[PDB]
């Protein structure tokens, strides 16, 4: 923006085919019948320069508006609320953000949830208990070698396999990769 304003000023120094770059000299030492000839080329050159500057400004205005609309959209979702869409505001699972004033824009602070310290476990997609295929209501099955557990996909919170946090469907033959294990039921200890 600064150079666009600056480059326009230098255009006044261009003769554009005239003998002088200043209007007063043209009005001074030129015969008025033919003085306009030097003026006419000068105005066209200056007008052409002015035309270019506005066109360049218009192009940048569209780019700024696109960025401005994008900035407003980010504020609409990632500031006024939580952006469920992934990687729209900060790498990682976005939580929220705080806008900050800038001389000609806005700066966000995207608070993101980045997991770390991962461990790999031997798992199965389903569990067979008494011939019934069990699936997890949420999370996935995991096992620290021998004992099996259920934990959410985004954090290691192992829990005992239980009827309440699992649902059954079908039989043990239709799904592949199943493992044989026992599903704890909280009612039995209460009943006994």
């Amino acid at each position: 923006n600064a150079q666009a304003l600056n480059t326009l000023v230098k255009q006044l120094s261009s003769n554009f085919g005239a003998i002088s770059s200043v209007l007063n000299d043209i009005l001074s030492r030129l015969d008025p019948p033919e003085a306009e000839v030097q003026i006419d080329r000068l105005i066209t050159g200056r007008l052409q320069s002015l035309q270019t500057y506005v066109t360049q400004q218009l192009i940048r205005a569209a780019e700024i508006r696109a960025s401005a609309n994008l900035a407003a959209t980010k504020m609409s979702e990632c500031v006024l609320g939580q952006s469920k869409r992934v990687d729209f505001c900060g790498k990682g699972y976005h939580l929220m953000s705080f806008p900050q004033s800038a001389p000609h824009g806005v700066v966000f602070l995207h608070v993101t949830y980045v997991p770390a310290q991962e461990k790999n476990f031997t798992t199965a997609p389903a569990i067979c208990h008494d011939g019934k295929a069990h699936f997890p209501r949420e999370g996935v099955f995991v096992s620290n070698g021998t004992h099996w557990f259920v934990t959410q996909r985004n954090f290691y919170e192992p829990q005992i396999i239980t009827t309440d946090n699992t649902f059954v469907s079908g039989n043990c033959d239709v799904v592949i990769g199943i493992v044989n294990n026992t599903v704890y039921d909280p009612l039995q200890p209460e009943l006994d």
Partner: protein, 162 residues
């Protein structure tokens, strides 16, 4: 007697004396570029020539984007610092020209019964910068194009409402 490739551009002339068709092409030209690592960081610079057979330009290294002078080719690939073009990049060791490194190649252990689950989490704040507006500028017509000159502005009116 001659041939034009396309768009009225001669590219082949047969010398009638010898009767042997010969191709004609414009000779080398283009934009010369300077590669520097920073004024304060160092002083050495490397000159880059674009799309020129490196035999008539003047350590010389030829690349797909022309040849550059002042850098030494390195087989080892590092992260790109100065983007030259055509997949080569330059940095400071002297100035070294090397093939761009896409990244760290890692083959994650994949299996039908392996789940990688995080046991810990890190909360990091990421700064995103976005402009929303620019300086509001206005330009006058009469006092700029001519400037306090009624006679000059009179001819301007002849152009209409530009």
């Amino acid at each position: 007697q001659f041939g034009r490739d396309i768009a009225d551009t001669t590219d082949a002339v047969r010398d009638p004396q010898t009767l042997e068709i010969l191709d004609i092409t414009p000779c080398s030209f283009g934009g010369v570029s300077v590669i520097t690592p920073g004024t304060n960081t160092s002083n050495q610079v490397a000159v880059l020539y674009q799309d020129v057979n490196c035999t008539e330009v003047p350590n010389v290294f030829q690349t797909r984007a022309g040849c550059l002078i002042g850098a030494e080719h390195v087989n080892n690939s590092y992260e790109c610092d100065i983007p030259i073009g055509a997949g080569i990049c330059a940095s400071y060791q002297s100035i070294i020209a090397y093939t761009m490194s896409l990244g760290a190649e890692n083959s994650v252990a994949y299996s039908n019964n392996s789940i990688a689950i995080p046991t810990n989490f890190t909360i990091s704040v990421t700064t995103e910068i976005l402009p929303v507006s620019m300086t509001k500028t206005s330009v006058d017509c009469t006092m700029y194009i001519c400037g306090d000159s009624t006679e000059c502005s009179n001819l301007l009116l002849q152009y209409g409402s530009f």
